[PDB]
Structures are given as C-alpha cells and as structure tokens.
Design an enzyme around this catalytic site. Structure first.
Site, PDB file in Angstrom:
ATOM      1  N   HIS A  51       7.768   0.310   4.123  1.00 50.43           N
ATOM      2  CA  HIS A  51       7.099  -1.010   4.644  1.00 50.43           C
ATOM      3  C   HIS A  51       8.256  -2.228   5.056  1.00 50.43           C
ATOM      4  CE1 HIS A  51       3.001  -0.646   3.349  1.00 50.43           C
ATOM      5  NE2 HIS A  51       3.158  -0.237   2.215  1.00 50.43           N
ATOM      6  N   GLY A  52       8.207  -2.811   6.124  1.00 49.16           N
ATOM      7  CA  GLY A  52       8.977  -3.613   6.537  1.00 49.16           C
ATOM      8  C   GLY A  52       8.650  -5.120   7.227  1.00 49.16           C
ATOM      9  N   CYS A  55       7.462  -1.759   9.747  1.00 44.30           N
ATOM     10  CA  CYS A  55       6.960  -2.968  10.645  1.00 44.30           C
ATOM     11  C   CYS A  55       8.225  -3.968  10.937  1.00 44.30           C
ATOM     12  CB  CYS A  55       6.011  -3.509   9.924  1.00 44.30           C
ATOM     13  SG  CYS A  55       4.313  -2.444   9.924  1.00 44.30           S
ATOM     14  N   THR A  66       0.832  -1.145  -0.056  1.00 49.97           N
ATOM     15  CA  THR A  66       0.020  -0.028  -0.112  1.00 49.97           C
ATOM     16  C   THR A  66       0.965   1.235   0.122  1.00 49.97           C
ATOM     17  OG1 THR A  66      -0.097   0.048   2.289  1.00 49.97           O
ATOM     18  CG2 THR A  66      -1.807  -1.019   1.388  1.00 49.97           C
ATOM     19  N   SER A  67       0.195   2.337  -0.521  1.00 44.00           N
ATOM     20  CA  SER A  67       0.864   3.848  -0.445  1.00 44.00           C
ATOM     21  C   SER A  67       0.757   4.223   1.056  1.00 44.00           C
ATOM     22  CB  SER A  67       0.150   4.705  -1.232  1.00 44.00           C
ATOM     23  OG  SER A  67       0.248   4.276  -2.606  1.00 44.00           O
TER      24      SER A  67
HETATM   25 NA    NA Z   1      10.986  -0.384  13.121  1.00 47.43          NA
END
Ligand code: NA
Ligand code: NA
Ligand code: NA
Ligand code: NA
Ligand code: NA
Ligand code: NA
Ligand code: NA
Ligand code: NA
Ligand code: NA
Ligand code: NA
Ligand code: NA
Lengths: 145, 94, 4
Positions: A93-94, A135, A34-35
């Site tokens: 993101h992560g 994340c 997602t953006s």
């Molecule tokens: Na982090």
C-alpha cells in the site's frame, strides 16, 4: 586505444548487483489496511525476471516499517564495489511519497536517502533503481476512447 | 568534480502522481505484470528507458478495471518513469 | 481488480 565514448553505465562489473524485493501482503489489523491479494504473483515474477538478468535477488515478506528501514540501512552499508547497480522493488500500500510497512508508513525519501551518492560510496556513479508498485493517492483515471 | 547526491537514481513508479495503482488478485499488478514481460522480451535488446516506455504503453493499452462499483469501474492507469540517471542503462554488456 |  581508439576513440572512447562514455554514454552508458559500466554494467560489466563481476556482479550485476542486488535486487531487493519487499513483498508486503498481510498488514497488521490495527492499520486497517487490506491484504494485497495477487502480490505473491508479482514477487515470483520479479524474482524470476531479475534472476535471468543475473541479479542477486533477496525476497522479503511482510516487513514492518522498522524492518524496512533497517533492511535498507544494512543493505546500503554493504560493500557494493564489485556490483554494477542496485535494484529495490517495493510492493505495498502507499500514498504520494509513502510506502506502507505492515504496521504503518515509511517515507520513500527515508529509504532512498540511504543510497545517496554521499552516503553509499560503493554505489556512487552507479544506477540505483527503485521500482514502486503502490498507490500515490486516490485519483482514478477515467481514460478516453 | 562532484556529482549530485540525487544523481543516478531511477524511480519506476507504477502510476502517475496522485493516482491509485491497480492490482489484480489473480494475475498480479498491471505494472509488475507488464514490467516483467517487457524485461523478458527486451532486456537483451533495448536501453532501459525504452523498455519502460513499452511498459507504459502496455499498461495504458491492455488494462482497464472491472468493478461492480461504478466509482471504480472502467478505469485506466499510466505508469510514471522518473529518471535522474546520467547515462544509458543496458542490462547486457560486451 | 483492486487498488493499492
Ligand atoms: Na507507484
Ligand atoms: Na504487488
Ligand atoms: Na548520487
Ligand atoms: Na550511491
Ligand atoms: Na551516484
Ligand atoms: Na485509475
Ligand atoms: Na515506471
Ligand atoms: Na499496477
Ligand atoms: Na514504466
Ligand atoms: Na490502463
Ligand atoms: Na535516463
């Protein structure tokens, strides 16, 4: 001279150092990611905050995994002799141990390994700060009143 | 003497290992909002680990998710300071 | 509030 203590990093080099901000907002459609609405507010806040700390801020937007690795490699090959420290901020993101380029993941160890004491000699002995908004998995903290 | 190749790194993670990290679409992320506020207030006053501890407190105290999805609602976050530093870090000098 |  008088008694000397060695408990704090030397932060009076001519330059504080670089602050590299990687601001990944828009991801390639095929990744399904997602953006990241709101990340531009973060990137602007960080730029201003580190500007007032006298860092040389470089903002980069929407980098692929290949571009992230090449940027880090190139930055680690600069001459940091006149710089007190190094800062890198990752906004993406992560997952645990992972940050996303716009087209797929990068191992965080791959990024930070460029700055190891044996691989970036002009930063040996100097603080290398990695600030990571991403994340680290999918657990949720329910808290307690 | 040699120094470890992993020495003198600091990883200021927005969230604890294994956890989601929260970003507000209007205000920015809880962690970066708080980090910038604490650097602005304390970078001329406090050592960096103490600044980051204030960031931990701010994220822990002042934020809680709001969601129409019960799975994602009323959730909390704690950041995670990971230090391999060998000295105190002050952003000021003299 | 969104997740990363
Ligand atoms: Na982090
Ligand atoms: Na962000
Ligand atoms: Na090192
Ligand atoms: Na180094
Ligand atoms: Na070092
Ligand atoms: Na949570
Ligand atoms: Na942190
Ligand atoms: Na956050
Ligand atoms: Na923190
Ligand atoms: Na919280
Ligand atoms: Na420390």
């Amino acid at each position: 001279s008088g008694i000397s203590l060695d408990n704090s990093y030397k932060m009076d080099y001519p330059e504080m150092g670089l602050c590299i901000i990687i601001n990944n907002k828009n991801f390639h459609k095929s990744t399904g990611m997602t953006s990241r609405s709101g990340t531009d507010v973060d990137a602007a806040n960080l730029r201003e905050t580190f500007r007032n700390l006298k860092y040389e801020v470089r903002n980069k937007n929407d980098l692929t995994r290949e571009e992230i690795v090449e940027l880090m490699r190139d930055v680690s090959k600069e001459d940091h002799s006149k710089r007190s420290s190094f800062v890198c901020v990752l906004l993406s993101h992560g997952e645990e141990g992972i940050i996303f380029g716009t087209n797929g993941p990068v191992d965080l160890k791959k990024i930070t390994n460029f700055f190891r004491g044996d691989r970036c000699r002009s930063l040996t002995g100097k603080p290398k700060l990695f600030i990571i908004q991403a994340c680290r998995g999918t657990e949720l903290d329910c808290g307690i009143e | 003497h040699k120094i470890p190749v992993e020495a003198d790194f600091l990883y200021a993670y927005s969230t604890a290992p294994g956890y989601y990290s929260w970003r507000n679409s209007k205000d920015g992320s809880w962690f970066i909002q708080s980090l910038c506020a604490m650097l602005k207030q304390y970078a001329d006053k406090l050592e960096f680990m103490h600044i980051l501890t204030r960031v931990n407190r701010k994220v822990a105290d002042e934020f809680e998710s709001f969601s129409f999805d019960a799975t994602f609602h009323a959730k909390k976050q704690i950041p995670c300071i990971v230090s391999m530093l060998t000295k105190e870090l002050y952003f000021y000098h003299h | 509030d969104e997740v990363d």
